[PDB]
Design a protein around this ligand. Sequence first.
Ligand code: FAD
Ligand code: MG
Ligand code: NA
Length: 279
Amino acid sequence: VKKWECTVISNDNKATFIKELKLAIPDGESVPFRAGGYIQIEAPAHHVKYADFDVPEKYRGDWDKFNLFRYESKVDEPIIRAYSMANYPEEFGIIMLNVRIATPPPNNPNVPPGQMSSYIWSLKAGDKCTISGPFGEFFAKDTDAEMVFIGGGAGMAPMRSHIFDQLKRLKSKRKMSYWYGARSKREMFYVEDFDGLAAENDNFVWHCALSDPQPEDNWTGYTGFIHNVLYENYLKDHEAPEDCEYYMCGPPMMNAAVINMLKNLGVEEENILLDDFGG
Ligand SMILES: Cc1cc2nc3c(=O)[nH]c(=O)nc-3n(C[C@H](O)[C@H](O)[C@H](O)COP(=O)(O)OP(=O)(O)OC[C@H]3O[C@@H](n4cnc5c(N)ncnc54)[C@H](O)[C@@H]3O)c2cc1C
Ligand SMILES: [Mg+2]
Ligand code: NA
């Protein structure tokens, strides 16, 4: 296991509650990881204020609505946490992460904010970030079966890594689709990336479903929760959904609803691979 003291290239919001942390590896080297894998970030003792975070006005609505800038996080001893690569292995020299900020639950507002994610959200371009690894178990199976990727929230990271690894490094012709659920259009990201792959690869398609599209979205795409949209628009009519491989990563409510849906279809657990962030 190696450690790298990386430099933060950027740490921009991609969604209301998700930042994309981009890290430059020293000397241009790469972490020798597999898609679906993860690194660990370690943080020293520190103290951060949410009021100091850089959150663009476009994403600030819920932050103001719930007074999330009230929070502070004091960490007296080093801590360490896993985060999944959003880049694939031939995106060299960098580690890209998608980090959800783990705020106090709205029903429990005076408990401490999430320690490591509040630290990551405090990082700005030029800061140093120590990572170690790589690790992993959420690896793609080596078959020719159709793949169905299902993502929500920061689960975008290992899905992006997997899908790019299949199409760019493995040059796979397997049938592949990606279904991503989000609340409204501002919560979407990597749209240029996946639109690009879908235009260039006739074996790949992707869909987004919004559960609460906003008036400003002018949304005419799928609406609702992703397990309903995947079922209604693809799996219901599928001639053999039990023969696909399902790769899923999302928030806990999404994981549970998707897995329940798949099992009611008769998919067996061997064909359902969950990357559980432990929410
Ligand atoms: C293999 C792996 C890969 C992962 N990849 C990703 C990834 O790519 N992106 C990502 O976002 N996450 C990922 N995770 C999850 C991630 O490691 C952290 O668990 C996550 O960031 C939360 O950690 P934290 O330190 O911010 O929050 P913690 O300090 O662990 O707190 C978690 C939550 O509990 C609340 N809390 C604190 N004190 C109390 C109390 N007394 N009572 C009740 N509640 C309390 C906090 O407000 C917070 O919401 C991954 C996890 C694993 C295992
Ligand atoms: Mg966005
Ligand atoms: Na396509």
